[PDB]
């Protein structure tokens, strides 16, 4: 449910 692409970066 919470594993999708959110545009997050390091």
């Amino acid at each position, epitope marked *: 449910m*919470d*594993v*999708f*692409m*959110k545009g997050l*970066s390091k």
Partner: antibody
Amino acid sequence: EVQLVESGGGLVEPGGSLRLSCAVSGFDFEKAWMSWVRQAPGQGLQWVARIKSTADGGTTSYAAPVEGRFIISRDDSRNMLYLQMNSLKTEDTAVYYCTSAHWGQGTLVTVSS
Amino acid sequence: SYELTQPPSVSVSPGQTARITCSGEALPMQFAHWYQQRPGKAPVIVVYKDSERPSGVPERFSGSSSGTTATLTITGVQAEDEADYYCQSPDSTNTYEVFGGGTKLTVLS
């Protein structure tokens, strides 16, 4: 559990157009950065296009072989992703996948006279 | 323009350990993700954001990432792990997505 279902693939002639649709369920589609990725027979995966979340500006990005011919768009109200494909070439023949870490089953696009 | 480099093939014996590498310039600033793709099926994620294990993925699959290399480790390899494995990461500006070339894993004997 998550599921993505693509539809709209089929046979179209070079120069033609097609519209692919993807229904998403099981995660917060509103926040998702969504991509199309394609796979020609026996080849590797090739990223096609991405659209950010509306809250992040909804910015579209395209792979260079398709830039200017294809248009990715989203409809948050219906949890739908779309790929509008134009001026299609035989080299665009592939299975088209809708993906945001998870993957749909794909839809077969055949470009042929 | 940005490319992720992945060995075309890796072969291992059942029960020993496979390491699949994915090398890219922007990996210090962008997450890598790993997908297994079985013959005739769609990719399924096995590593999310460098090192997180998606739910239902077996414990033998794990990832890590440091510097310009992300690595997928499969411990106690089985015959069932034969498949193509892809890494994915965006470019340094996070404007476009890039896939590795894929790695075909073959289980010997």
